Design a protein around this ligand. Structure first.
Ligand SMILES: CONC(=O)c1cn(C2CCCCC2)c2nc(Nc3ccc(CCN4CCCC4)cc3)ncc2c1=O
Length: 279
């Protein structure tokens, strides 16, 4: 679904600090980048932030009620508490008074990784995206935070084509995206998450392996030509794994295979992945 802080790094608190408040009159809205069922994000210019800056602003749609306004405040609260990292879309501000709740984050000018992969690209660039995402994920794991939608569509590229992850669950067009199965991104999910609804850092690691396959296939849909149905679930349960992508060095495919261990404890950690990638 969306990002979640779990217990045991140690979790002292379950996450609004008004230090983040920014005046909404100092934002000018531009184009819409995307929207979900209850949320949307627009690009904006913010004047005097922290500096005149292109930023992304997340807000509710008209269709949202108090339940959704709370999920948005709850996302703002998680973001305020995690702290900053180069490979996360960072919180910059919020407007929680004088109007609808606005959450202000870094704008990533190159858009999403999936579309970038699909549109020259070098092997070193692919390895960098892979490392950048792994670093963001190790950061989250170090904060006892689970992502639960790791996927190329959910990695953004900013200046220097540096990759960032973020919690885009409220602004993700889920209802009109057939990769979410009546709604879960099943082709990216670990078996324990499909068959037991269990979600852990290790389940995120499985999804990371799927992301790697997307990157090194240059954006193929996972499990090419295979429909999500009974046969699909039996395959993954029975240990079926996608073939090595055309642009993956064998050592990178070995990371995927490791991420896809059926036993979650036999999967690597994100720090181990970063370490191996740096080598
Ligand atoms: C924590 O809250 N932040 C988010 O939800 C953000 C959402 N999205 C997005 C995450 C992906 C899903 C949508 C919001 C962002 N997209 C960009 N960059 C971006 C630029 C261009 C495109 C393409 C725009 N066009 C596509 C067709 C018509 C418009 C997409 C993303 N920069 C930041 C964010 C968030 O902080």
């Amino acid at each position: 679904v969306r990002w979640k802080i779990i217990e045991s790094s140690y979790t002292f608190i379950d996450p609004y600090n008004e230090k983040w408040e920014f005046p909404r009159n100092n934002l000018q809205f531009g184009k819409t980048l995307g929207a979900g069922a209850f949320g949307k994000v627009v690009e904006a210019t913010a004047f005097g932030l922290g500096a005149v800056l292109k930023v992304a602003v997340k807000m509710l749609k008209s269709t949202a009620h108090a339940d959704e306004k709370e999920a948005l405040m709850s996302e703002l609260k998680i973001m305020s508490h995690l702290g900053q990292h180069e490979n996360i879309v960072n919180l910059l501000g919020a407007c929680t008074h004088g109007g609808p709740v606005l959450v202000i984050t870094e704008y990533c000018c190159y858009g999403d990784l999936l579309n970038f992969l699909r549109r020259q690209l070098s092997s070193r660039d692919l390895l960098h995206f892979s490392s950048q995402v792994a670093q963001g994920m190790a950061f989250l794991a170090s904060k006892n935070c689970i992502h639960r939608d790791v996927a190329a569509r959910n990695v953004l590229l900013t200046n220097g084509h540096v990759a960032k992850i973020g919690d885009f669950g409220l602004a993700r067009d889920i209802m009109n995206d057939s990769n979410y199965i009546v709604r879960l991104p099943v082709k990216w999910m670990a078996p324990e998450s499909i068959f037991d609804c269990v979600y852990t850092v290790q389940s995120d690691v499985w999804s990371y392996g799927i992301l790697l396959w997307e990157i090194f296939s240059l954006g193929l849909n996972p499990y090419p030509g295979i429909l999500v149905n009974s046969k699909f679930y039996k395959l993954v349960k029975d240990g079926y794994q996608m073939a090595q992508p055309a642009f993956a060095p064998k050592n990178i495919y070995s990371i995927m295979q490791a991420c896809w261990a059926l036993e979650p404890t036999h999967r690597p950690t994100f720090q181990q992945i970063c370490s191996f990638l740096q080598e």
